[PDB]
Amino acid sequence: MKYAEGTRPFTILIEGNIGSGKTTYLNHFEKYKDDICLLTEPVEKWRNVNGVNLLELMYKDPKKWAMPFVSYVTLTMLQMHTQPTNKKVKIMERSIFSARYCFVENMRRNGWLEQGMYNTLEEWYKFIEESIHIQADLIIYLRTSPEVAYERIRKEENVPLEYLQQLHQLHEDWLIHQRRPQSCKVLVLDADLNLENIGTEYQRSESSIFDA
Amino acid sequence: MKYAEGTRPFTILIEGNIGSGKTTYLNHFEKYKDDICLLTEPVEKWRNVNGVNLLELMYKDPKKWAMPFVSYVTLTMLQMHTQPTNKKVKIMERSIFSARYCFVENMRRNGWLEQGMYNTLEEWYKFIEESIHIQADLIIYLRTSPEVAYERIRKRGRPEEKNVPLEYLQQLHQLHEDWLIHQRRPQSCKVLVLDADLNLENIGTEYQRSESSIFDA
Numbered sequence: 001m002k003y004a005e006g007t008r009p010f011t012i013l014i015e016g017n018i019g020s021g022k023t024t025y026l027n028h029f030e031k032y033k034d035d036i037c038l039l040t041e042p043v044e045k046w047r048n049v050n051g052v053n054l055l056e057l058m059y060k061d062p063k064k065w066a067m068p069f070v071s072y073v074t075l076t077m078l079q080m081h082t083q084p085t086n087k088k089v090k091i092m093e094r095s096i097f098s099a100r101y102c103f104v105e106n107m108r109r110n111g112w113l114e115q116g117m118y119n120t121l122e123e124w125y126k127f128i129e130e131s132i133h134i135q136a137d138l139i140i141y142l143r144t145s146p147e148v149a150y151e152r153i154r155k156e157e158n159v160p161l162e163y164l165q166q167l168h169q170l171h172e173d174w175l176i177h178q179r180r181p182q183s184c185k186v187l188v189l190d191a192d193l194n195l196e197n198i199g200t201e202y203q204r205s206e207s208s209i210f211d212a
Numbered sequence: 213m214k215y216a217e218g219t220r221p222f223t224i225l226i227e228g229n230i231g232s233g234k235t236t237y238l239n240h241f242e243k244y245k246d247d248i249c250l251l252t253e254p255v256e257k258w259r260n261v262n263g264v265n266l267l268e269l270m271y272k273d274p275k276k277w278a279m280p281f282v283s284y285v286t287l288t289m290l291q292m293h294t295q296p297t298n299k300k301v302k303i304m305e306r307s308i309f310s311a312r313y314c315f316v317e318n319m320r321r322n323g324w325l326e327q328g329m330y331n332t333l334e335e336w337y338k339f340i341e342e343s344i345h346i347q348a349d350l351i352i353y354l355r356t357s358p359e360v361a362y363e364r365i366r367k368r369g370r371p372e373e374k375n376v377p378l379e380y381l382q383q384l385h386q387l388h389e390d391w392l393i394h395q396r397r398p399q400s401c402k403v404l405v406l407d408a409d410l411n412l413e414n415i416g417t418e419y420q421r422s423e424s425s426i427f428d429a
């Protein structure tokens with residue numbers, strides 16, 4: 001058996017470049033937090049590993065901090081995947097899959113993970129796949145232009161357009177092309193548009209809009 | 213449930229310093245191969261990781277290769293722990309527990325893992341404890357004085373090991389003492405201690421297999 005086979009709520013992964021409006025799109029589901037297990041990317045855990053800020057240390061010295069940073073990131077996504085709930089729906093911001101097919105892969109290309117390290121991570125991903133139950137029912141792709149993504153990131157971190165281009169192509173390879181092992185179906189939103197009002201045609205029966 | 217809760221054979225962990233005679237001790241169980249799942253240190257996997265040799269690189273440049281080396285070593289020990297068998301006894305050379313409590317701790321103390329890396333590895337060990345079933349019924353501790361183990365390493369000249377200083381052996385000695393004698397680590401099972409300053413070539417030989425030709429007519 002795999003670990004946490006009992007965690008099987010309908011599990012939606014929100015995927016997107018930096019600055020694809022993931023945070024906005026996710027905030028819209030808050031009204032449903034009583035019926036939906038809502039998990040936003042755990043940046044604050046990356047900023048504070050028993051004292052240490054792995055996020056700064058990585059965007060400062062990526063050659064040194066890549067392996068440890070992606071290692072910890074991978075753990076935190078694995079916790080979100082395996083996190084039990086009595087709710088019928090889980091929506092996660094990103095996934096172990098975006099860690100493996102996008103961030104790790106870009107880090108290998110940019111030379112921040114040598115072949116030694118890369119091979120070790122891939123061996124772990126194969127072990128994780130064999131050993132840990134990861135419910136993935138649906139992916140929502142917030143698909144952007146790198147140009148549009150770069151504008152949004154200005155509003156913060158020192159991130160070049162070229163990094164966003166790199167992450168865009170890997171997202172295109174995974175979610176549009178089918179060049180990675182594909183767990184589930186993908187729905188694409190044009191995240192170039194403003195998504196402030198997405199889904200608002202749907203209203204909760206409990207909303208004051210339906211009071212007498 | 214945890215992964216591989218089905219792998220439940222009586223599992224014995226052989227632990228000791230570099231040079232404690234673990235390879236000799238394990239080889240004496242070879243006559244029991246039909247009834248024991250015998251799993252020796254997977255050094256060969258560490259010497260070829262889809263082409264790369266991680267052991268060399270770690271003893272060459274520990275500061276760079278410590279995080280990767282110990283992460284992969286951890287994986288290979290997990291593969292032995294979780295390996296299924298129809299035999300009633302599994303005997304493993306070392307464990308994830310020596311990786312965590314001895315080798316990772318020693319690399320942190322020697323500055324080859326910065327706090328960031330150590331903390332990340334600890335979070336994973338805690339997750340592995342929670343997620344993966346690790347059968348541990350017995351530890352046999354091949355206890356040595358560092359000086360006797362130093363001498364044994366010299367007499368072998370095993371290329372990677374040759375240049376290990378006495379001070380490194382002392383460090384790993386004290387980490388084994390803290391775990392297997394002092395109980396300063398979370399202890400899963402009982403420990404039996406051999407005096408591995410002595411030669412163990414002939415240990416257990418009062419016991420002979422009935423199938424042995426010494427009991428042929």
Ligand SMILES: Cc1cc2cn([C@H]3C[C@H](O)[C@@H](CO)O3)c(=O)nc2[nH]1
Nearest residue numbers: 018041073077094095098099103157
């Ligand atoms: C799964 C995953 C999330 C993630 C985020 N990040 C960075 C990019 C953004 O600037 C920041 C907030 O998402 O974290 C990364 O470098 N690798 C990652 N992998």
Ligand SMILES: Cc1cc2cn([C@H]3C[C@H](O)[C@@H](CO)O3)c(=O)nc2[nH]1
Nearest residue numbers: 230253285289306307310311315373
């Ligand atoms: C679990 C574990 C085994 C192990 C072996 N080794 C080294 C010590 C010896 O020189 C060699 C074979 O025991 O491998 C290490 O550096 N870290 C390790 N961790």
